[PDB]
Design a protein around this ligand. Sequence first.
Ligand SMILES: *[C@@H]1O[C@H](CO[C@@H]2O[C@@H](C)[C@@H](O)[C@@H](O)[C@@H]2O)[C@@H](O[C@@H]2O[C@H](CO)[C@@H](O[C@@H]3O[C@H](CO)[C@@H](O)[C@H](O)[C@@H]3O)[C@H](O)[C@H]2NC(C)=O)[C@H](O)[C@H]1NC(C)=O
Ligand SMILES: *[C@@H]1O[C@H](CO)[C@@H](O[C@@H]2O[C@H](CO)[C@@H](O[C@@H]3O[C@H](CO)[C@@H](O)[C@H](O)[C@@H]3O)[C@H](O)[C@H]2NC(C)=O)[C@H](O)[C@H]1NC(C)=O
Ligand SMILES: *[C@@H]1O[C@H](CO)[C@@H](O[C@@H]2O[C@H](CO)[C@@H](O[C@@H]3O[C@H](CO)[C@@H](O)[C@H](O)[C@@H]3O)[C@H](O)[C@H]2NC(C)=O)[C@H](O)[C@H]1NC(C)=O
Ligand SMILES: *[C@@H]1O[C@H](CO)[C@@H](O[C@@H]2O[C@H](CO)[C@@H](O)[C@H](O)[C@H]2NC(C)=O)[C@H](O)[C@H]1NC(C)=O
Ligand SMILES: *[C@@H]1O[C@H](CO)[C@@H](O[C@@H]2O[C@H](CO)[C@@H](O)[C@H](O)[C@H]2NC(C)=O)[C@H](O)[C@H]1NC(C)=O
Ligand SMILES: *[C@@H]1O[C@H](CO)[C@@H](O)[C@H](O)[C@H]1NC(C)=O
Ligand SMILES: [Ca+2]
Ligand SMILES: [Ca+2]
Ligand SMILES: [Zn+2]
Length: 535
Amino acid sequence: NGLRDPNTRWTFPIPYILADNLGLNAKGAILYAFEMFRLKSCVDFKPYEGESSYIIFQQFDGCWSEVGDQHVGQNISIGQGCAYKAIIEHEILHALGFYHEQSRTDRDDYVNIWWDQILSGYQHNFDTYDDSLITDLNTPYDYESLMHYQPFSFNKNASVPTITAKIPEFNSIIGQRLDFSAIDLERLNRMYNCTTTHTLLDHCTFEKANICGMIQGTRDDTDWAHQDSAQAGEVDHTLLGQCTGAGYFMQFSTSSGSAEEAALLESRILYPKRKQQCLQFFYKMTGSPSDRLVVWVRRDDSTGNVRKLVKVQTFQGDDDHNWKIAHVVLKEEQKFRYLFQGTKGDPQNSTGGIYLDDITLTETPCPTGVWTVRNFSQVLENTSKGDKLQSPRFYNSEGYGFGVTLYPNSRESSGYLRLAFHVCSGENDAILEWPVENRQVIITILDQEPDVRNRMSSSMVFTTSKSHTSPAINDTVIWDRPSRVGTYHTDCNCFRSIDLGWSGFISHQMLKRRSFLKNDDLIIFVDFEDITHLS
Ligand SMILES: *[C@@H]1O[C@H](CO[C@@H]2O[C@@H](C)[C@@H](O)[C@@H](O)[C@@H]2O)[C@@H](O[C@@H]2O[C@H](CO)[C@@H](O[C@@H]3O[C@H](CO)[C@@H](O)[C@H](O)[C@@H]3O)[C@H](O)[C@H]2NC(C)=O)[C@H](O)[C@H]1NC(C)=O
Ligand SMILES: *[C@@H]1O[C@H](CO)[C@@H](O[C@@H]2O[C@H](CO)[C@@H](O[C@@H]3O[C@H](CO)[C@@H](O)[C@H](O)[C@@H]3O)[C@H](O)[C@H]2NC(C)=O)[C@H](O)[C@H]1NC(C)=O
Ligand SMILES: *[C@@H]1O[C@H](CO)[C@@H](O[C@@H]2O[C@H](CO)[C@@H](O[C@@H]3O[C@H](CO)[C@@H](O)[C@H](O)[C@@H]3O)[C@H](O)[C@H]2NC(C)=O)[C@H](O)[C@H]1NC(C)=O
Ligand SMILES: *[C@@H]1O[C@H](CO)[C@@H](O[C@@H]2O[C@H](CO)[C@@H](O)[C@H](O)[C@H]2NC(C)=O)[C@H](O)[C@H]1NC(C)=O
Ligand SMILES: *[C@@H]1O[C@H](CO)[C@@H](O[C@@H]2O[C@H](CO)[C@@H](O)[C@H](O)[C@H]2NC(C)=O)[C@H](O)[C@H]1NC(C)=O
Ligand SMILES: *[C@@H]1O[C@H](CO)[C@@H](O)[C@H](O)[C@H]1NC(C)=O
Ligand SMILES: [Ca+2]
Ligand SMILES: [Ca+2]
Ligand SMILES: [Zn+2]
């Protein structure tokens, strides 16, 4: 589906204008989509500064783009309801040079188009092009492609589909609005010569005996064991016992020796391109409650030698023995190495140890709040329609309190989750401005893969607004101070606002695909941050 003529190719970074007929929500959503491109490809974007061809993003009727670089500068429309990651990425892929997936020359081998069902004026989105105009980039037809239409697209009748897969199973798969497919990234890389990406700095799964180039220190007392996943119940996080003799984690036993013994596992040297990074990993602590996992940085002391230590975070064992996710913010502006110190406490009271797998390091912020729901595949069966779960309270950088509500069986839409955001009372409320006004919420359901290029995390975006009001609170703003417009909960001593979000956030069948439920538990990320400065 890529335009063949090389004079249609951009030279990076692509200069952009965000126009003031966009709302703040749309500007923030576009900048969030540019971060996803920089994180999964070598595509890059810059503010305009006066250049020959450029993309101007505007609000007109519907979502659309011209295809490929137009040398006089071009327009990308993001209308009402278009301001979602997957939709912005679809229009930017048009500007980069891609037509819809159903427009491939071979498409009649894979899908049926029902022409008399298409609403007038939209039919060109179902055209197919000759191989003189379009390349396949030597890739097969991808039903999972972000560039493929859903069955009920531009249909005259709500019951009859416009496009259907010839093999009938894929009717449930085509038209996904998660993220780029693997084949979409391969096509993008083949078109633009991307061998790397601007923002994935390191990742590790411990699956090769090289342990991702990690080294073990000798100023410590002991070593981490590279561990085989063969022993009963000792499964690795990357594969959870799926493949025999082939899943690997790092282990530090705490059941023997002296208290306060330690082991250092230390990364290879890294060269950061930005001022901030996020280190994500999975761990367990089945040992003593006094065992510790500590994360450290070792960095250039400005002589060019990596020696200076900084302690960044500490983790400890609660009563939960299943795998946990962790995020650590790093602020490294010179070359460095990230380090794990495992430490024993009370070895005569430990029958276990510390475990590590699935490290990822990105030159991004960390998620502001993270919620894990355990046994979700069982929660989904044991919960009536309109029953709910609620997250613990999180806090912004700005100090606002917030949380999320999950209704596992949406009474508003059967066969979907309903996931929604609320503002919580917190210790800061007296000094914060109310209503919260132009703060953008991003909710993400993590696709649990260690390489970010394999992740199709579902995500939704909205901006808190003075127009968000409810009859339940005498038609006042939902985002006013939670002590006057929320309801008290004994679960955290919080007042929680009325919630706003999506019935139909994700379907139960989509949630059982990919790695959304990897260990039969569900990981939701949330961010809540000011975007007023984009005005
Ligand atoms: C010695 O170890 C015990 C038990 O620890 C358990 O068994 C070990 C072999 C390991 O497998 C451990 O991972 C495992 O937890 C310690 O008992 C623990 O003590 C803490 C503190 O009292 C308990 O936490 C409390 O839990 C209650 C609710 O039950 C809360 O209300 C409290 O606020 C607090 O969180 C923990 O439940 C308890 N664990 C168990 C399963 O008994 C013991 O303290 C430890 N002693 C020493 C000297 O370190
Ligand atoms: C992005 O889209 C907008 C809207 O399509 C483009 O602005 C448009 O520019 C054209 C060409 O100048 C305008 O056409 C002219 O309109 C005047 C009357 O306004 C008429 O006298 C001329 O004969 C001609 O038809 C068009 O009206 C104008 N639309 C608006 C609303 O301003 C814009 O150029 C596009 N930008 C890029 C870089 O693609
Ligand atoms: C991505 O990498 C490929 C492979 O290096 C680039 O394709 C190559 O592009 C150059 C021009 O930069 C081509 O050279 C030109 O060839 C034409 C005749 O085909 C000639 O008329 C020109 O004077 C010039 O010599 C080269 O042939 C071409 N090779 C292939 C395999 O197509 C491609 O441009 C890169 N794309 C980018 C910039 O992302
Ligand atoms: C939209 O499509 C549905 C399904 O084809 C149509 O409903 C059928 O209409 C025929 C003729 O009236 C009935 O014999 C069937 O029993 C109907 N089936 C269902 C599922 O109701 C519907 O009429 C179409 N609507 C439009 C706008 O033509
Ligand atoms: C999720 O469900 C599993 C399976 O029911 C729970 O694991 C069992 O937990 C009970 C009570 O601790 C034990 O007696 C069983 O032996 C466990 N079975 C297995 C397969 O391990 C698990 O505890 C549940 N987790 C949560 C957090 O609810
Ligand atoms: C809304 O109005 C009713 C009737 O005046 C009153 O009883 C109730 O307390 C009001 N609630 C709020 C949110 O002020
Ligand atoms: Ca050592
Ligand atoms: Ca592993
Ligand atoms: Zn499109």
